[PDB]
Design a protein around this ligand. Structure first.
Ligand code: MG
Lengths: 121, 778, 132, 63
């Protein structure tokens, strides 16, 4: 994927990168910057379950990170969010291609596990 | 060991005043020489322009004018030829363009309106102009400088200067690379910063990155050179080109007198982009820009009548020179100076317990901090140490601070405990190791609407930002006096210091001991080392983001070929000592093979690390060639001066300020001075801006109150000229400040000491420091 | 938008409607540094330790009071209107934008007493700006 | 301070035809920092556009 020459001949040196939202200090407080959620569905019921978190995490904004359902055959269908991005204050403008403080989006990623239960126990 | 130049690092400052001695300033050769001189004139005055023009009008001149009018009335305006001859015997072509001199007279006691017309030409160009601060360089004989070179007839000195500007060639300035350099710690920087990653150094890209290949990037370096010597006092310009339409860049002017003293003038302070639309919106890194800042190599050859020639050009004996922004408060010293950086550079942090301390070693800290009240509001009305010093002065009690015994210990500790520790390990809470300050942070402008964590620890002194400003919650966000100066203060606090009795007998007020210490400097016999120190004592020694004149390479001993303590200022009074130091130099100068060296697409702390080994392909970083000292600074320098002001916190007070001693933040305008300088008894029709009737008709107590209220009104230095905030619906703002500063630097207020003849019981000191510009005079 | 309108001459600073939307105010910070007298029975007097406050002469004490009283703060600086933080732009426009949220945090001027002005020249009633 | 503005060039040929050239298209503000952000009205700017009066005198051989 990437030849040795890029690094070896310093063709595009890596830059240092600062913290996003840098005014939130201490790891304990910075935990509030992370949006998380979880859920479980089974083959016995197809009701859809939202993966809903909060930003900032513990005014707070509800963030729908996704939705999950399982049909009677055992297939899990995972839906992403509605596309809703937002700042904590309307005046906070997202003017950098990638690094904008005070913003959150509903993108997510995480872990998918399962348990199989046969009739024999 | 025969002859050497002094100072080892000269400083000249840009200005739009002329490069003539009667209208210029001279870099300090003795520290503290004129701190209360209420006659200083840092701006070109009407009076100087008049006596400049008078001396040019001493006959011959006048009757050779008498004879031109003997040919004016046998015709009964001027002639092209008689015009360009009254010019030329006056000899003002070097001051103002010749065709405006000519046009001034063609559009017209014969004597008088020749002068009246030309004085208005001079006034139009130079009235209220920022005088250039020039550096004198001296040849000393040694064997250890004995005294200045003695030029008998037959002898002659020939000076050589080669200078360059590499700002446009070099890398962005994001923060100081040495913040992550592994070290044992020095007197200037504790090993904690790098050890605990309190302000990590950032990578930095090339300035003007669209110019590619090293050979095309050489066009980005401005360079010039020149020579003078004892046998001619003709001033020779150091004129380069940018890029190397093309613009001429006057990098400086050199001249040598009959006794062999070189005088170095800096440029006129002219910065410019290759296209008008290129705006200098960043504090340091603006593509398409150049300025007339320079720095370069100073060498000389002494040729005696005896045929004996002495080449002065090895790094041990040669000198350097650097031009800088103007000094807008020349009598106001920065709390930590460049000279202090030279002194700390040779020290090791963990050997600081062997340092020995006199009161004169800690006195400059309190003295400087105390005098910061004229350039910074926090140190006027929000500095509990300055207030306590006032309390002591009020009762003639300042001498207690010189008492090294137990009975004064609690008094000395209370002051010392308010000062920030350059170990940067106090007022922190360790996160697991991350060090998070629990005192007041300076936020990013990128805000996050989550409640700040309450500070549990008071903010320590001084209230200035520091090299780690980029990192909210780092202790290196705030300035600390460097480890060796803090060691002096620690010893003082504990009582481990000495002082002479005669020092105690001039210490009733801080002002009294300050004068005593000043006359110690003046009567010190080592003029060579005093001139070396004077060149750097007015420069800033932190914080470096990137600083005002010079920046972080100077606080490393690796950049000096020699850096040795020599003696105290007085046999029994150290006053931080006198040192002999020279910079490492590439003796090839402008023809160096490393003149156009760099590190590729970015510079990083890893390049700085590799440069430590004196035998690496990176060790050139420390062997300076012309342009190497100033290339780190912001381009153009005005952008960085305009971003050198307040850094406001959510808390209103105290107002943090970067470098108030040289770029003031809050000043006392002339307008207020004219409203408190008079006593109620004065017999003029206007007293302190009031009618005679009103001023004398009030109770004297109320009169004094009005004086002090006036005295207390401090104005934002950014407001002493139009930096984009003037007019209905004007935007003002940070960025307009940088842009306008390119042309408004020469109209910003200049602080000068002035007298209050009879302050009565007003509480106003007899000497005040007053900021002069065209907007703040009334 | 209703604040100062600067002229090329520094003084006097022109202001629009300062009586209802003040321009230069006397903040609580300064009030707390002139309201006390030298005799006050408080461990802190006018922002100084008891001992320093009472160690200085009465002349210099009242002088300090008057200097503090003389410090007026731009009203636009009594809340974060875009000038706070390293490299902040501030400026007119950010003021307009930020005032939508910050209007409720701007300093509110209220009459407050000075029980013992002594010789300082500070009136018995002063008008003090309260903000965070 | 003060800039020369070439508003145009004129010339007459031996047959009496007048030829009028315009300026070089030089527009400029009295200070580099003055930017022309409005489509019509920008203070501190000048350009070399012009317009004016065209007259002549005919002089014959008979006077
Ligand atoms: Mg100064």
């Amino acid at each position: 994927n990437l030849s040795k020459n890029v690094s070896k001949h310093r063709l595009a040196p890596a830059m240092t990168a600062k913290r996003r939202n840098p005014n939130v200090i201490t790891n304990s407080l910075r935990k509030q910057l992370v949006i998380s959620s979880q859920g479980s569905v089974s083959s016995d019921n197809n009701t859809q379950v939202p993966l809903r978190g909060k930003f900032p995490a513990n005014e707070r904004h509800n963030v729908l990170q996704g939705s999950i359902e399982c049909d009677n055959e055992g297939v899990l269908r995972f839906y992403a969010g509605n596309g809703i991005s937002q700042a904590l204050s309307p005046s906070s403008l997202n003017t950098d291609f990638a690094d904008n403080s005070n913003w959150f989006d509903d993108i997510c990623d995480g872990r998918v596990t399962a348990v199989v239960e046969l009739k024999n126990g | 060991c025969q002859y050497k130049i002094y100072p080892p690092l000269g400083i000249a400052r840009v200005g739009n005043g002329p490069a003539i001695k009667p209208l210029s300033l001279s870099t300090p050769e003795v520290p503290w020489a004129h701190l209360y001189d209420t006659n200083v004139q840092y701006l070109v005055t009407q009076q100087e322009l008049e006596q400049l023009l008078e001396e040019a009008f001493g006959g011959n001149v006048i009757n050779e004018i008498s004879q031109i009018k003997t040919k004016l009335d046998e015709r009964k305006k001027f002639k092209q030829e008689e015009i360009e001859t009254i010019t030329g015997l006056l000899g003002l072509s070097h001051l103002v363009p010749q065709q405006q001199l000519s046009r001034s007279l063609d559009n017209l006691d014969i004597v008088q309106q020749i002068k009246g017309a030309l004085l208005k030409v001079l006034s139009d160009h130079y009235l209220h102009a920022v005088k250039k601060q020039a550096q004198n360089f001296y040849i000393y004989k040694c064997d250890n400088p004995v005294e200045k070179l003695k030029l008998t007839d037959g002898d002659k000195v020939t000076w050589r200067v080669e200078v360059a500007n590499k700002k446009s060639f070099w890398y962005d300035y994001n923060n100081a690379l040495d913040l992550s350099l592994h070290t044992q710690g020095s007197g200037n920087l504790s090993k904690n910063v790098s050890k605990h990653r309190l302000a990590p150094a950032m990578t930095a890209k090339r300035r003007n990155p669209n110019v590619i290949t090293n050979s095309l990037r050489k066009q980005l370096v401005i360079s010039s050179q020149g020579s003078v010597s004892s046998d001619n006092n003709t001033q020779v310009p150091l004129r380069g080109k940018f890029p190397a339409e093309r613009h001429n860049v006057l990098q400086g002017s050199i001249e040598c007198d009959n006794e062999g003293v070189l005088r170095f003038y800096a440029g006129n302070g002219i910065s410019q982009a290759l296209s008008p639309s290129s705006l200098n919106t960043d504090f340091a890194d603006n593509s398409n820009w150049f300025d007339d800042i320079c720095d370069g190599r100073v060498t000389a050859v002494v040729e005696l009548k005896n045929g004996d020639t002495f080449e002065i050009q090895d790094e041990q004996s040669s000198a350097w020179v650097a031009t800088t922004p103007p000094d807008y408060a020349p009598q106001i010293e920065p709390i930590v100076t460049m000279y202090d950086m030279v002194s700390g550079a040779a020290l090791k942090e963990q050997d600081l317990d062997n340092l020995t301390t006199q009161f004169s070693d800690v006195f400059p800290i309190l003295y400087r901090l105390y005098r910061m009240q004229w350039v910074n509001q926090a140190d006027f009305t929000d500095n509990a140490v300055n207030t306590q010093i006032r309390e002591l002065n009020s009762e003639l009690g300042f001498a207690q601070l010189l008492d090294n015994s137990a009975s004064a210990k609690s008094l000395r500790e209370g002051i010392f405990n308010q000062f920030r520790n350059p170990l940067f390990d106090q007022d922190i809470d360790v996160d697991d190791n991350e060090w998070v300050s629990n005192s007041r942070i300076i936020p990013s402008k990128d805000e996050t609407n989550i409640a700040a964590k309450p500070a549990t620890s008071s903010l320590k002194l001084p209230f200035y930002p520091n090299d780690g400003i980029d990192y909210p919650g780092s202790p290196v966000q705030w300035f600390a006096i460097p480890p060796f100066m803090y060691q002096h203060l620690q010893n003082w606090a504990a009582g481990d210091f000495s002082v002479t009795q005669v020092e105690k007998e001039s210490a009733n007020t801080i002002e009294e001991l300050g004068l005593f210490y000043s006359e110690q400097f003046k009567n010190s016999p080592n003029s060579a080392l005093l001139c070396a120190r004077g060149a750097l004592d007015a420069l800033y020694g932190g914080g470096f983001h990137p600083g005002v004149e010079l920046t972080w390479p100077m606080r490393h001993n690796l950049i000096y070929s020699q850096n040795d303590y020599v003696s105290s200022v007085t046999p029994e009074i150290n006053l931080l000592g006198l040192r002999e130091f020279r910079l490492k130099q590439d003796l090839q100068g402008l023809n160096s093979p490393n003149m156009y060296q760099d590190f590729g697409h970015v510079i990083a702390v890893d390049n700085v690390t590799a440069s430590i080994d004196p035998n690496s392909d990176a060790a050139w970083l420390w062997r300076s060639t012309p342009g190497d000292l100033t290339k780190w600074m912001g381009i153009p320098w005005q952008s960085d001066a305009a971003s050198c002001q307040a850094v406001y916190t959510p808390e209103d007070f105290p107002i943090p300020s970067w470098w108030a001693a040289n770029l003031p933040v809050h000043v006392l305008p002339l307008a207020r001075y004219n409203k408190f300088k008079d006593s109620q008894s004065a017999d003029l029709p206007e007293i302190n801006g009031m009618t005679h009737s009103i001023a004398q008709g009030m109770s004297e107590e109320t009169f004094e109150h009005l004086r002090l209220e006036q005295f207390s009104q401090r104005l934002d230095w950014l407001h002493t000229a139009d930096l984009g905030f003037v007019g209905y619906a004007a935007e003002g703002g940070y960025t307009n400040g940088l842009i306008q500063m390119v042309s408004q630097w020469k109209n910003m207020a200049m602080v000068m000491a002035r007298p209050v003849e009879n302050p009565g019981s007003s509480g106003i000191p007899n000497v005040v420091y007053v900021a002069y510009s065209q907007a703040d005079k009334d």
